[PDB]
C-alpha cells in the first residue's frame, strides 16, 4: 500500500502544484504588486515617517548582501 500512497502523493502534489503554482504566482505578483503597491501596511508609513520608496531601496540593500552574503538560494 506504500506504493499506492506514494502515487497518491504524486497526484495530490500535481493538483496542489497546478493550483499551488498559480496561487504562488499570484501571491508573488501581489507582493510584487504590493511592492509596486507598497501602501497596504504603509498607512502608518503614509500617516508619517514612511517614504514609500520601497522595493528599489530594498533591492539595492539585498543585492549587496546577497552578493557578499551566503549562498544566493
Amino acid at each position: 500500500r506504500n506504493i499506492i500512497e506514494r502515487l497518491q502523493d504524486i497526484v495530490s502534489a500535481l493538483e496542489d502544484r497546478l493550483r499551488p503554482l498559480v496561487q504562488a504566482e499570484l501571491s508573488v505578483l501581489v507582493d510584487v504588486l504590493h511592492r509596486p503597491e507598497l501602501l497596504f501596511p504603509e498607512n502608518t508609513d503614509a500617516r508619517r515617517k514612511c517614504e514609500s520608496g520601497g522595493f528599489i531601496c530594498k533591492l539595492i540593500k539585498h543585492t549587496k548582501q546577497l552578493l557578499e552574503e551566503n549562498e544566493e538560494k
Partner: protein
C-alpha cells in the same frame, strides 16, 4: 575569559576564586533590605550594585559552555532559581537583567543535550494516530521533570507576560537609552524561548506582541539585535504549518476513501486568480488577523541594519505559505525497521558530511 568561550581559561578562573570570594562588605532578607537600601538613590547601594553587576559576568564567564564546571557552578544556580523570582519582583531593571541571563544559562546547561528547536520528526504512526490540531504530544519525556522545567516555563510566560504591557511602554514610549535599559529587559529573554520547547500557542501570542512592539512612528545596537533575536523567533513558527499539514494530509490519505476526494486548503485558472484576487482582497484590503504579519515583514525591510538580509529572507519565506510544504511532502522519508531506518539516517548524515568535505 568569558568572551573567549575558550574553555581552559574558564576552568582556571573557576578554580581561582576559592580564596577571597569578595571585595566589599556584605541573604534573602538582607537582599530585600539591600534592595530597600538600594531604594536609597545614593551612594553605598550604588557600590553594591556595581559589585553585583560584575558578579554576573562572574556567572557569565562561568557560564560559557561547560557542563562539568557548571556542576561546579551549581550552588549559585540553585540560589539563582530562587533569585530569579527576586529578578522579577525586585524591579531591578539594570540589575536583574543580568539575573535573567544567568538563569537561562544555568537551566540550559543543566538539561537535555538535544537543544530542542527544530522538529525533524514529520512522520506518524501507521494510522493518523488521533488527529490532534489542539494539542501536540511529541515526546513528553525529553525532560524528566518536564513540569520542573515547566515550573520555570510557568515563571517564563509570566515574565513573557511582563513584556506584554511593556509593548505599550517600549512602543507607547519611544526608544531611549533608559528604554534601552528596558531594552536589556527583553535583551535575551526571548533566547530562552529558543531552547524552550515545552509548548506552542504562547509562542504565537508572543509573535503577535513583537509585531505590536514594532509600530507607531520612526540605531538600536541591541535593539536591532532584539529584532534580530525576534527574527530568529519567527523562524520557529514556520515549522508548525508544515507539521500540521503533513498530519492532515496523511490522515486523509490513509483511509480506504482515497479516490480524489481531497479538496481541502492548507490555509479554475481564473478561479485561482479569483481566489488570488480574493486573497488580494484580503491582502490589499493560526487564522487570526494576518495583515499584521505582512506589515511586520514590510516594517523590517524598512528598518534595515546589517542583519537586514536575514530579515528579508524571512519575509520571502513567510510570504510563501504552502508551496514548499508540498515539496516538504517529498522530504518526509515499518515499526520494526524504523530504528534501523533511524540508524541509517544518522549514518547517511555522516556520509553526507564526508561527501561535503570531499
Amino acid at each position: 575569559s568569558m568572551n573567549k568561550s575558550i574553555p581552559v581559561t574558564q576552568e582556571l578562573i573557576c578554580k581561582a576564586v576559592l580564596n577571597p570570594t569578595n571585595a566589599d562588605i556584605l541573604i534573602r532578607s538582607k537582599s530585600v533590605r539591600e534592595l530597600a537600601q538600594d531604594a536609597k538613590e545614593g551612594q553605598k547601594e550604588d557600590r553594591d550594585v556595581l559589585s553585583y553587576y560584575r558578579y554576573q559576568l562572574n556567572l557569565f564567564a562561568r557560564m560559557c559552555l561547560d557542563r562539568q564546571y557548571l556542576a561546579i557552578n551549581e550552588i549559585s544556580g540553585q540560589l539563582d532559581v530562587d533569585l530569579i523570582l527576586r529578578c522579577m519582583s525586585d524591579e531591578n531593571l539594570p540589575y536583574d537583567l543580568r539575573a535573567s541571563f544567568c538563569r537561562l544559562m544555568l537551566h540550559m546547561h543543566v538539561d537535555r543535550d538535544p537543544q530542542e528547536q527544530v522538529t525533524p520528526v514529520k512522520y506518524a504512526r501507521l494510522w493518523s494516530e488521533i488527529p490532534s490540531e489542539i494539542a501536540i504530544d511529541d515526546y513528553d519525556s525529553s525532560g524528566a521533570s518536564k513540569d520542573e522545567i515547566k515550573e520555570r516555563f510557568a515563571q517564563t510566560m509570566e515574565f513573557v507576560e511582563e513584556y506584554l504591557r511593556d509593548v505599550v511602554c517600549q512602543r507607547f514610549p519611544f526608544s531611549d537609552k533608559e528604554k534601552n535599559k528596558l531594552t536589556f529587559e527583553v535583551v535575551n529573554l526571548a533566547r530562552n524561548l529558543i531552547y524552550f520547547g515545552f509548548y506552542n500557542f504562547s509562542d504565537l501570542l508572543r509573535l503577535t506582541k513583537i509585531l505590536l512592539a514594532i509600530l507607531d512612528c520612526v540605531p538600536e545596537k541591541e535593539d536591532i539585535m532584539v529584532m534580530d533575536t525576534k527574527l530568529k523567533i519567527i523562524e520557529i513558527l514556520q515549522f508548525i504549518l508544515n507539521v500540521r499539514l503533513d498530519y492532515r494530509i496523511s490522515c486523509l490519505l490513509c483511509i480506504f476513501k482515497r479516490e480524489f476526494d481531497e479538496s481541502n486548503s492548507q490555509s479554475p485558472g481564473a478561479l485561482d486568480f479569483e481566489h488570488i484576487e480574493e486573497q488580494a482582497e484580503g491582502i490589499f484590503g493560526h487564522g487570526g488577523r494576518t495583515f499584521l504579519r505582512v506589515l511586520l515583514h514590510l516594517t523590517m525591510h524598512d528598518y534595515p541594519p546589517l542583519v537586514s538580509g536575514a530579515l528579508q529572507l524571512l519575509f520571502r519565506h513567510f510570504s510563501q505559505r504552502q508551496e514548499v510544504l508540498q515539496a516538504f511532502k517529498q522530504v518526509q522519508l515499518s515499526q520494526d525497521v524504523d530504528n534501523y531506518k533511524q540508524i541509517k539516517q544518522d549514518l547517511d548524515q555522516l556520509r553526507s558530511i564526508v561527501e561535503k568535505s570531499e
